[PDB]
Symmetry: D3
Subunit: 92 residues, 6 copies
Amino acid sequence: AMALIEVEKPLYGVEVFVGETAHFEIELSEPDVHGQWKLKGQPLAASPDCEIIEDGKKHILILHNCQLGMTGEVSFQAANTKSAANLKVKEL
Amino acid sequence: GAMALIEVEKPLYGVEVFVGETAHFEIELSEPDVHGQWKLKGQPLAASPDCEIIEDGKKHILILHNCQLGMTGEVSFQAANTKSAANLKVKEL
Amino acid sequence: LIEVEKPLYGVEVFVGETAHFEIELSEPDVHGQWKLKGQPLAASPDCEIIEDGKKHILILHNCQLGMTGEVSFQAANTKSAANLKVKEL
Amino acid sequence: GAMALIEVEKPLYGVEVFVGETAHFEIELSEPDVHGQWKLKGQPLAASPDCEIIEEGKKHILILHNCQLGMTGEVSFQAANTKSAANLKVKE
Amino acid sequence: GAMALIEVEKPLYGVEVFVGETAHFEIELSEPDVHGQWKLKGQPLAASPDCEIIEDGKKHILILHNCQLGMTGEVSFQAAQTKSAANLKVKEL
Amino acid sequence: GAMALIEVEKPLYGVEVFVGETAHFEIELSEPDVHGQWKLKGQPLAASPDCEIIEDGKKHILILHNCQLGMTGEVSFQAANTKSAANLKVKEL
Ligand SMILES: [Zn+2]
Ligand SMILES: [Zn+2]
Ligand SMILES: [Zn+2]
Ligand SMILES: [Zn+2]
Ligand SMILES: [Zn+2]
Ligand SMILES: [Zn+2]
Ligand SMILES: [Zn+2]
Ligand SMILES: [Zn+2]
Ligand SMILES: [Zn+2]
Ligand SMILES: [Zn+2]
Ligand SMILES: [Zn+2]
Ligand SMILES: [Zn+2]
Ligand SMILES: [Zn+2]
Ligand SMILES: [Zn+2]
Ligand SMILES: [Zn+2]
Ligand SMILES: [Zn+2]
Ligand SMILES: [Zn+2]
Ligand SMILES: [Zn+2]
Ligand SMILES: [Zn+2]
Ligand SMILES: [Zn+2]
Ligand SMILES: [Zn+2]
Ligand SMILES: [Zn+2]
Ligand SMILES: [Zn+2]
Ligand SMILES: [Zn+2]
């Protein structure tokens, strides 16, 4: 009988101008848990411009060269644990 | 600044599994600690008790428990510019 | 007390094929050691010893008749064993 | 035999944030699993809730929450032989 | 969530070494993957070839090569809440 | 897939230790995340409270607590290709 994984620090919303970078972070209740990030409900492919990072209880997503079409919900799920927040891309 | 592309050193290979059995896939990259993404039939896979995604140094492993007929198709993996694919054949015994 | 959450399970393989064992512990990053027939296992191309979080994995490639026997694992205080059966096709 | 020196592959670049927001810095090394040290205005950074030091593979990240005008200055990183610096500007 | 503070499961022990020799310190925390900082005589340690900072799961290690007499003093470690200290004594033959 | 063999970059050094104290061995390989095996007098080490096996990037470390006279002899490490050996010398104060 083991505890389900929980979100200790949820995702916060990010604002970013076109071409700049957005960073998201979430902290889980326990280290080394596997999860998956989505943007506007579509799973993210890792790329030079989309970097998926894990370090202990922390999960980080780095989105470089953000574009207007990217505005919408960023979400993360690792088993039971789920969090979501808004990404707003602005022009100047 | 001069860095080698990530390459596949040992590629995915095909597996045949009977229904209800588990299948495992593995690939070895040229560099350790490279983030990898797995897909089955073109759909990105997420970790769960029956779909375990494993990373250890240069090795990437996918374990699929309780395989079902409808899972037959291409398993693919991508890590940086490194890509590999092989077939999952589930047989009805 | 570090516990075993999902124990080793037995596996059957044909000669030449690969066998995989797996165990899930209650805690991640615990140093694990594997044995086959009571003999400690070193990593090699045909014997791959994997750790990722709570999961420990042993992959045995090109299995041979003489390898039939008990596969066992220990991490801190937790122990688990199961059988490898290699058979001719 | 010959071992390559660790190099900076993707250097630190400057970040500008407004007072009270968080700034994220990012550097990529030529090799994974290299132990790195961060500094802000020449002082070694101590990991905290507001000051998070992250490593994953070739990637090293520094997150500074609730930035203050007094924190404007040079952020530097060093790992083995590799060094990078960029500016944190907290904007009024 | 409601999380336990990091604790010290096994504290630093004192080390004594002759000059030129290496000292090794070891502390075990209650949780793996916790980030910490080492200090020597109250000063943050920079990680040269002679000063190696190591982490593996719940264990944190400091290796100091080529110890000199000036290094005699308190070695401390801090990871969030968790803190420990022990004496380094450097002796002349 | 055209890959370099793992090599020892920093070999094991010999350690002298008094009875009851702890000995610390370290070796550095040419690549991080390589799996290896430690031996004492040609016998594989079983990890225990007094026998700790540590990995961190290119570094491999062995910690032997509460050293006893009978433990004197060769300590070795091998990672596939790579092998290094050094002497453990336990003495009475
Ligand atoms: Zn940011
Ligand atoms: Zn971990
Ligand atoms: Zn970390
Ligand atoms: Zn980046
Ligand atoms: Zn416009
Ligand atoms: Zn090539
Ligand atoms: Zn990753
Ligand atoms: Zn499984
Ligand atoms: Zn490993
Ligand atoms: Zn219990
Ligand atoms: Zn249980
Ligand atoms: Zn398998
Ligand atoms: Zn280990
Ligand atoms: Zn393999
Ligand atoms: Zn993992
Ligand atoms: Zn060399
Ligand atoms: Zn480190
Ligand atoms: Zn944070
Ligand atoms: Zn020592
Ligand atoms: Zn050293
Ligand atoms: Zn290399
Ligand atoms: Zn690594
Ligand atoms: Zn110890
Ligand atoms: Zn490390």
